[PDB]
């Protein structure tokens, strides 16, 4: 396999991958989320392709101060082969390449597993509360 | 005469000074480098608040194509009776909306109830989530 940048043709294949990995939350329209990312900057939005097919994603980003990562998933049939790791290790390097000093990720608290994965890779938990506010509402889909 | 506008190169050392006075600097974040990171990337969400020509508040707003962000929110100790932080976040929020950003997320210290309360009062809600981070470039 091989990690590259998301391109428009990857659009339905990615949604259908997010489907299979249950990354889909009713609040967030994934069509909209991809459109936003496209309008914005696709360059830290990476896909893993095996056999000329997408099997993993990470929507990474950078705001001029912190790196981010959302929509990190790997196809349940492709889960043994270090894909999410290759995917995070490519993002972190693409971030360093543009002077991003730190990346920060939110993980569901009850998910003790994915929590251990990140810690393994040298991520520290911060003693902060994440606070959020909805600015634009996504319809149901 | 208070006015919120976008950060300008001229504001550079005034803002650093304000960050000092606002007890916002940390030895692991070089504020010159952070200002420079931001300028090189996109300065349009990096807001200041000026009162009679003086910069007395900032917010380094941000957007990543999915989520909006805010760092370095400070208002000069002497300019705190006046809704300036509120004005800073309100404008940032409008600016995020203007470019299609659906949501802003801000991390606040688990101790700092005064700040948690401000955000709640502004309509921010707690997410049942844990913040993990990884330093990629050390400032030194
Ligand atoms: Zn396609
Ligand atoms: Zn810790």
Swiss-Prot record, chain A:
Q: Which UniProt keywords apply?
A: Acyltransferase, Transferase
Matching PANTHER family: AMINOALKYLPHOSPHONATE N-ACETYLTRANSFERASE-RELATED-RELATED
Q: Which family does it belong to?
A: Belongs to the acetyltransferase family. YpeA subfamily.
Name the gene for this chain: ypeA
Q: Which GO terms describe its molecular function?
A: acyltransferase activity, transferring groups other than amino-acyl groups
What's the name of the protein?
A: Acetyltransferase YpeA
Highest taxon, organism lineage: Bacteria
CDD domains linked to this entry = NAT_SF
Domain (N-acetyltransferase) ranges: 1-141
By its UniProt entry, which NCBIfam families does this protein fall under?
A: PRK03624.1
- Cross-referenced Pfam families, in alphabetical order? Acetyltransf_1
Tell me the disulfide pairings in this chain: none
Is Acyltransferase among this UniProt entry's keywords?
Answer: yes
What HAMAP family does the record point to? Acetyltransf_YpeA (MF_01127)
What are its E.C. numbers?
Answer: 2.3.1.-
Q: Which InterPro entries match?
A: Acetyltransferase_YpeA, Acyl_CoA_acyltransferase, Bact_Acetyltransf, GNAT_dom
């Amino acid at each position: 396999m091989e990690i590259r940048v998301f391109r428009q043709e990857d659009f339905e294949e990615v949604i259908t991958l997010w489907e299979r990995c249950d990354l889909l939350r009713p609040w967030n329209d994934p069509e909209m989320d991809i459109e936003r990312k496209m309008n914005h900057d696709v360059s830290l939005f990476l896909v893993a392709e095996v056999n000329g097919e997408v099997v993993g994603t990470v929507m990474g980003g950078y705001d001029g101060h912190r790196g981010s990562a959302y929509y990190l998933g790997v196809h349940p049939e492709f889960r043994g082969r270090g894909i999410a790791n290759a995917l995070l290790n490519r993002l972190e390097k693409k971030l360093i390449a543009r002077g991003c000093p730190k990346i920060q990720i939110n993980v569901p608290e009850d998910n003790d597993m994915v929590l251990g994965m990140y810690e393994r890779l040298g991520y520290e938990h911060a003693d902060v509360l994440s606070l959020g506010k909805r600015l634009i509402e996504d319809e149901e889909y």
